[PDB]
Design a protein around this ligand. Structure first.
Ligand SMILES: *[C@@H]1O[C@H](CO)[C@@H](O[C@@H]2O[C@H](CO)[C@@H](O)[C@H](O)[C@H]2NC(C)=O)[C@H](O)[C@H]1NC(C)=O
Ligand SMILES: O[C@H]1[C@H](O)[C@@H](O)CN2CC[C@H](O)[C@H]12
Ligand SMILES: [Ca+2]
Ligand SMILES: [Ca+2]
Lengths: 857, 88
């Protein structure tokens, strides 16, 4: 990374002004005579004692244990930005009642208790409690700062320069900031995207964490520089409770974290907009996930194929190359769902076009992939070549849908097609236009098996300040680029996802990968960690990066398998396939200057280990799909830190070399060259874990040193769970999606287990519009395995049947009996390994749509 | 009075099974020899007879996968995909 291209806090005048305020007595005070209490909110005027600026505090109790704080000017010269399209609904409120009052304080009860809010008038402060337990304070360090809007026209407050880029800053200083105290909290997480540790560091002696969507070339590790996406959500965990803070601001934001009986203080500082913050009071982390999901929505249910393996590079040369790659997977018995087409596929980086030499017949190429039951992904960026012969440019220029400069002209910058303009994705008509451009009549050469990749949507501008858009560019409604920056990418993602839904008549689920993102981006598809590097430490950082994203609702995360920059040695490429095979978005990708690394180009030993990793992933597709359905319905992360599952185990709070998938699998991928073993922490008092390869049982809590070879992927199934698999690995997921299921039952020490399974057609909205799906619950206790409906609304005509049950931790029965309505009682044959206590039940033969029971006699 | 037929024995000797476990869509032999006609074994093989032209063997996992692997189309017999003869 070239750090001189990106501002430190001292170089961002508003960060420098805000951060120069140190702890002390706040000059703000609430004017209790102006207090008004209604059923939805409490409003009170606040005043700055020196400048006499009046602000309005809108305080609300909300259903699901949340509190909302909104602060804005009472009489502004012009309106302040309020973030649109991120909240999925107007949050249901909870009545605040005065239960206490004196000349400097008002105590408010939320609904019928137990939550209470204490408003102190002088200095202005808010305390949030549950009964007698102090959960958090607001403005306890007196760091609240609301720069009021001055008459439009010290150093850098107004006109400001960074390198040679000038910000005319017509509205002058307008930054807002506020501090929060978390007594009892020593561990905080979230606020992606940073190439840094899962457990966030204190920022006291260095830079605050920065949230400003930026294209950072050759980004480095373990630092707080802003990367491509921004989710202004911070989680706090302790043995006793979970809390969350959601700071709804789209402007450049800096976050300071400090420690101090134990307590963590958080300070947020944003360039413009209002103070709009949600306090998510838990008490469990699952309660925080539900709280946040009620505000910003849940993960969009990926079409099944998008959870398979993706093969990409910058670039496949032409149609012949794409078809050779397709054939290479089949000739080497390696599954793959999608082959990707980077920027060289288009006509000179004119998006929605095809190079007439390289891709003269895209429909024929797509038909060939469709005959292999595979898909393709085409890159479409939000920058349009300035070319009068390019229809997209002419329509957007003619309709005035580009982002403008202050003088009213269309902004033109440098990007991949040379001179390019930037569509104003904040304008709803622009998003409608973009969505309609994906119709099969408009996007010539596209077909239903063509999906989309949105890159450079920060937006990336080569000659702009910090490689992005000028702060004083103008958007829809007259808002400045500074006001909206962090939602520009989200709007690109939203409009592309809508385009894929609309072109199909509203039937097909979209698949869109996006580089830039914000709160709510989980609703539109997948994200990835950008341009990582082919190095061991970048393989390791993929875990804390995707975990930081999972915690804040972005479950469909991944990092480029093999690293984007440079050439990975074969061992590193194998280990990356193993890591990627257990991460939500699984794509091999590589930079333009790299050697080819399609997996069959390596020596046989490496090919075999990669094939094994691909087979493991493909067999787990019913499990991945079920976790994603759970994320879609509940807002629960797919990929999880161990502390989410073991909240009282303090030794798990910083773990980032291991992770869990749902509640059932614990993964410790090998991430060092030449490793012959791994240290695995298996938590849980009275918990057991099964090594999924050897079936060896291990009791928790323990740190085990496990031996590994090149083909090893340290994976453990938790006792008490049932994992569904497709054991017949075929060339793509479409090939497997009607196949029989094998149930892997890992018995707890009490001899019990449970697990769920979601199934549908694999790609439409029929699960929601027609309730065409199945949600099954498998449960084991005593000597009986049962399948029952977990959602009776769901029905599905399917040939899927249960071909096998593998039971880990079971003794040898004398007989095995299957009962299902509509059939005579059946006797199943079985095989039992006394050394591992593994019981295999042969061919139950029952439909997955039916209730049934298997009794071990 | 009535002489019974002998059971099937896997080509690798790992098991002896009734002939109703041959092509019964469940893998009973470690070598895949009980399932030449189905996708049930991970290491089985399906024979493309390709009547009139060169015969070919394909992976079992390509039986009823919805993809046309044999030029005679016999690998796709219960998948929904109807393959055309392309052996010529
Ligand atoms: C809202 O908060 C209440 C209070 O903390 C939650 O209720 C408690 O739940 C815990 C389990 O996490 C129990 O130990 C307590 O006994 C419950 N307390 C009371 C007063 O009921 C409640 O689950 C939260 N609700 C939501 C929707 O998040
Ligand atoms: O390969 C992609 C990469 O995945 C992106 O992060 C950046 N892109 C810049 C140009 C090219 O499209 C390249
Ligand atoms: Ca058989
Ligand atoms: Ca086939």
């Amino acid at each position: 990374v070239d750090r001189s291209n990106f501002k430190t806090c001292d170089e961002s005048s508003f960060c420098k002004r805000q951060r120069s305020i140190r702890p002390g007595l706040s000059p703000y005070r609430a004017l209790l005579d102006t207090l008004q209490l209604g059923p939805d909110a409490l409003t009170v005027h606040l005043i700055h004692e020196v400048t006499k600026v009046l602000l309005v505090l809108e305080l609300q109790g909300l259903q699901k244990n949340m509190t909302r704080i909104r602060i804005d000017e009472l009489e502004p010269r012009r309106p302040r930005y309020r973030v649109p399209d991120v909240l999925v609904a107007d949050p249901p409120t909870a009545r605040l009642s005065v239960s206490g009052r004196d000349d400097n304080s008002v105590e408010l009860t939320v609904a019928e208790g137990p939550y209470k809010i204490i408003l102190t008038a002088q200095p202005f402060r808010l305390d949030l409690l549950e009964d007698r337990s102090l959960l958090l304070s607001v403005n306890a360090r007196g760091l609240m700062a609301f720069e009021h809007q001055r008459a439009p026209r010290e150093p850098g407050a107004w006109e400001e320069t960074f390198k040679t880029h000038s910000d005319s800053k017509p509205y002058g200083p307008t930054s807002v900031g506020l501090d929060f105290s978390l007594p009892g909290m020593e561990h905080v997480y979230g606020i992606p995207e940073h190439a840094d540790s899962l457990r966030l560091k204190v920022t006291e002696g260095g830079e605050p964490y920065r949230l400003y969507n930026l294209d950072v070339f050759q980004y480095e590790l373990n630092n707080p520089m802003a990367l491509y996406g921004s989710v202004p959500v911070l989680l706090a965990h302790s043995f006793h409770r979970d809390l969350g803070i959601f700071w709804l601001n789209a402007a450049e934001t800096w976050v300071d974290i400090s420690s101090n009986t134990p307590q963590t203080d958080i300070r947020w500082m944003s360039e413009s907009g209002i103070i709009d913050v949600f306090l998510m009071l838990g008490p469990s982390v699952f309660d925080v996930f539900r709280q946040y999901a009620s505000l910003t929505g849940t993960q969009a249910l990926p079409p099944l194929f998008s959870l398979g393996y993706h093969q990409s590079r910058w670039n496949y040369r032409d149609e012949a190359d794409v078809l050779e790659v397709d054939q290479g997977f089949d000739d080497h018995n390696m599954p793959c769902d999608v082959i990707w087409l980077d920027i060289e596929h288009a006509d000179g980086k004119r998006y929605f076009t095809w190079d007439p030499t390289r891709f003269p017949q895209p429909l024929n190429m797509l038909e060939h992939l469709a005959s292999k039951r595979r898909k393709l992904v085409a890159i479409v960026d939000p920058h349009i070549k300035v070319d009068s012969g390019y229809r997209v440019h002419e329509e957007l220029r003619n309709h005035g849908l580009y982002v403008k400069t202050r003088d009213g002209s269309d902004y033109e910058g440098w990007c991949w097609p040379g001179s390019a303009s930037y569509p104003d994705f904040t304008n709803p008509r622009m998003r409608a236009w973009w969505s309609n451009m994906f119709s099969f009549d408009n996007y010539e050469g596209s077909a239903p098996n063509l999906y989309v990749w949105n890159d450079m949507n920060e937006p990336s501008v080569f000659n702009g300040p910090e490689v992005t858009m000028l702060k004083d560019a103008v958007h829809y409604g007259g808002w400045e680029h500074r006001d909206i920056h962090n939602i520009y990418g989200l709007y690109v993602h939203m409009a592309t996802a809508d385009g894929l839904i609309q072109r199909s008549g509203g039937i097909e689920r979209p698949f869109v990968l996006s580089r830039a993102f914000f709160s709510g981006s989980q609703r539109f598809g997948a994200v990835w960690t950008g341009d990582n590097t082919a190095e061991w430490d970048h393989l390791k950082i993929s875990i804390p990066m995707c975990l930081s994203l999972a915690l804040v609702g972005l479950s469909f995360c991944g990092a480029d398998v093999g690293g984007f920059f440079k050439n990975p040695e074969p061992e590193l490429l194998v280990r990356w396939y193993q890591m990627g095979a257990y991460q939500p978005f699984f794509r091999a990708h590589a930079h333009l200057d790299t050697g080819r690394r399609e997996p069959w180009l390596l020596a046989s030993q490496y090919q075999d280990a990669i094939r094994d990793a691909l087979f493991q992933r493909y067999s787990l597709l019913p499990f991945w799909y079920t976790l994603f359905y759970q994320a879609h319905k509940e807002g629960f992360p797919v990929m999880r830190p161990l502390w989410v599952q073991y909240p009282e185990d303090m030794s798990t709070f910083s773990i980032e070399d291991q992770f869990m998938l749902g509640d059932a699998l614990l993964i410790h991928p090998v991430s060092d060259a030449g490793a012959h073993g791994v240290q695995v922490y298996l938590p849980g008092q009275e918990e057991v874990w099964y090594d999924i390869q050897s079936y060896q049982k291990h009791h928790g809590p323990q740190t085990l040193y496990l031996p590994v070879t090149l083909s090893s992927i340290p994976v453990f199934q938790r006792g008490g769970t049932i994992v569904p698999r497709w054991m017949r690995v075929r060339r793509s997921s479409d090939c497997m999606k009607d196949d029989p299921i094998t149930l892997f039952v890992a018995l707890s020490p009490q001899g019990t287990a449970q697990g769920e399974l979601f199934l549908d057609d694999g790609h439409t909205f029929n699960y929601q519009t027609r309730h065409e799906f199945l949600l099954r619950r498998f449960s084991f206790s005593g000597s009986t395995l049962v399948s029952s409906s977990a959602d009776p609304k769901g029905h599905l005509e399917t040939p899927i049947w249960i071909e096998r049950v593998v039971i880990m931790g079971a003794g040898k029965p004398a007989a095995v009996v299957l009962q299902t309505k509509g059939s005579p009682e059946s006797r199943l044959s079985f095989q039992h390994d006394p050394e591992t206590s593994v019981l295999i039940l042969r061919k139950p033969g029952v439909s997955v749509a039916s209730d049934w029971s298997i009794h071990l006699r | 009075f009535y002489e019974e037929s002998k059971p099937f024995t896997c080509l690798d000797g790992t098991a002896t099974i009734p002939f109703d476990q041959v092509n019964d869509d469940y893998c009973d032999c470690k070598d895949g020899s009980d399932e030449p006609g189905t996708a049930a074994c991970p290491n089985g093989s399906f024979h493309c007879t390709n009547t009139g032209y060169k015969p070919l063997y394909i992976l079992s996992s390509r039986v009823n996968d919805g993809v046309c692997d044999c030029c005679d189309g016999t690998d796709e017999y219960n998948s929904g995909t109807v393959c055309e003869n392309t052996c010529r």
